[PDB]
Amino acid sequence: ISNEISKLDPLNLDAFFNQLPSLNQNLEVSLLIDKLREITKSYLPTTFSINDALAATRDLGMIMSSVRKLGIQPVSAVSDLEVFLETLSEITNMVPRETSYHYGPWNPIGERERRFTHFPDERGLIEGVRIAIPGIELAIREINQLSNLSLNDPAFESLAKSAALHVYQAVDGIGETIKKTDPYVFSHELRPFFDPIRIGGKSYIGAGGGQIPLFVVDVKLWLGNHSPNSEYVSFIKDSVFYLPPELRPICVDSLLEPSVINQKFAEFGSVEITDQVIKGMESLLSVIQVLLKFRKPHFQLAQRTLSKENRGNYTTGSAGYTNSFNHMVLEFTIEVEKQIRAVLAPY
Numbered sequence: 001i002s003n004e005i006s007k008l009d010p011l012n013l014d015a016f017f018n019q020l021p022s023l024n025q026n027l028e029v030s031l032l033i034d035k036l037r038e039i040t041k042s043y044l045p046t047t048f049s050i051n052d053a054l055a056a057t058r059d060l061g062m063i064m065s066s067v068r069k070l071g072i073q074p075v076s077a078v079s080d081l082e083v084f085l086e087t088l089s090e091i092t093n094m095v096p097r098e099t100s101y102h103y104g105p106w107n108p109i110g111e112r113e114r115r116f117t118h119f120p121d122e123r124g125l126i127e128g129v130r131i132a133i134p135g136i137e138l139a140i141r142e143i144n145q146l147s148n149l150s151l152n153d154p155a156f157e158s159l160a161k162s163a164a165l166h167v168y169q170a171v172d173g174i175g176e177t178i179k180k181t182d183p184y185v186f187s188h189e190l191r192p193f194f195d196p197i198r199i200g201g202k203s204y205i206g207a208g209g210g211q212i213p214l215f216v217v218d219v220k221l222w223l224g225n226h227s228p229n230s231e232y233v234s235f236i237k238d239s240v241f242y243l244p245p246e247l248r249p250i251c252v253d254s255l256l257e258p259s260v261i262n263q264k265f266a267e268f269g270s271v272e273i274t275d276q277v278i279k280g281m282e283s284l285l286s287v288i289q290v291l292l293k294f295r296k297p298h299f300q301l302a303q304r305t306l307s308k309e310n311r312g313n314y315t316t317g318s319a320g321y322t323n324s325f326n327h328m329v330l331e332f333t334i335e336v337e338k339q340i341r342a343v344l345a346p347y
């Protein structure tokens with residue numbers, strides 16, 4: 001529950017986070033490092049509830065990212081963090097780092113909102129994932145119910161429509177980023193806050209909107225187990241254990257099964273094609289077409305951001321890919337649309 005985590009301040013950092021944008025602007029690394037040290041001596045994380053540990057991962061993660069932004073590995077500089085992070089990670093059963101979950105839906109709205117910088121463009125990122133994630137999560141549950149209904153059942157069409165509506169929340173979220181986040185300001189002022197951090201011998205990437213569980217919708221809906229050695233499966237493979245635990249079984253099951261659309265392609269070309277069946281297959285095109293309404297403007301925005309004019313120090317996103325990856329996911333998604341349009345063409 002997002003609001004039950006967003007309202008917590010387990011490490012009493014509310015005042016500190018009002019100062020953090022200024023601390024970051026003036027490069028006050030000592031104050032950052034003093035705060036990490038104060039936390040490891042002030043708090044016994046083992047006594048935390050789950051929601052407390054999730055909110056503490058949010059707050060501690062963002063301070064660690066500010067230190068890493070300067071170029072210092074924060075756990076190397078504050079070595080007692082490692083034990084602290086290990087204890088939090090056992091309670092959350094999540095990585096010892098913040099993700100888009102902690103930064104968006106679990107990040108409080110209004111005066112307490114945790115932010116790296118004073119730049120209003122940063123709001124574009126936060127609101128983007130804060131809007132996308134709950135809607136994608138609702139679409140995931142509806143799309144998983146589709147495998148067991150008939151294309152001729154009107155409940156199928158109704159569920160698929162409900163999920164297209166819920167996926168639109170991701171469209172609205174990337175639209176908010178496009179309005180609020182200048183590509184140049186992103187590459188020069190925000191991107192450096194999302195770099196990898198070394199914790200207990202492993203490197204954990206920084207938060208990314210690619211951590212919204214849209215890839216989980218893909219796997220269930222069209223990717224399934226049909227593209228084993230693809231670059232997209234390798235990114236999903238790398239993402240499964242960044243997800244909150246409750247989404248991991250859905251994703252793993254889906255990676256090892258035929259997708260909904262491959263199955264409904266088989267059923268369609270094998271059953272009495274009625275008027276409901278065509279409506280049912282048309283509701284899947286509708287979901288796919290909402291994904292395109294997300295991925296097309298998204299591709300454009302990553303292209304402007306990584307252009308020679310607007311990029312700064314980076315040629316890649318926080319997960320380490322170029323816009324070539326985005327293009328590859330978009331082509332995949334366009335191919336699905338073309339395939340469904342063929343199955344429907346004689347109707």
Ligand code: HEM
Pocket residue numbers: 124125128129132170173174177181183186208209210211212214215295298301302305306316317318319320321322323325326329330
């Ligand atoms: C200035 C803003 C943004 C830029 C420059 C950007 C760029 C990128 C890049 C470079 C990747 C490749 C993965 C990586 O290397 O990190 C990626 C993938 C992805 N990004 Fe963004 N992005 C931005 C905003 C957003 C927002 C606000 C969201 C969600 C609300 C989002 C959702 C995704 C998703 C879901 C993927 C996985 C690929 C896909 O599903 O098509 N991005 N993006």
Ligand SMILES: N[C@@H](Cc1c[nH]c2c(Cl)cccc12)C(=O)O
Pocket residue numbers: 099100103125126128129191194207208209210316317318319
């Ligand atoms: N990964 C992308 C943009 C990005 C980084 N962090 C984000 C967050 Cl926390 C939300 C939305 C987008 C982004 C890039 O590094 O170019």
Ligand SMILES: [C-]#N
Pocket residue numbers: 208209210211317
């Ligand atoms: C993309 N974040």
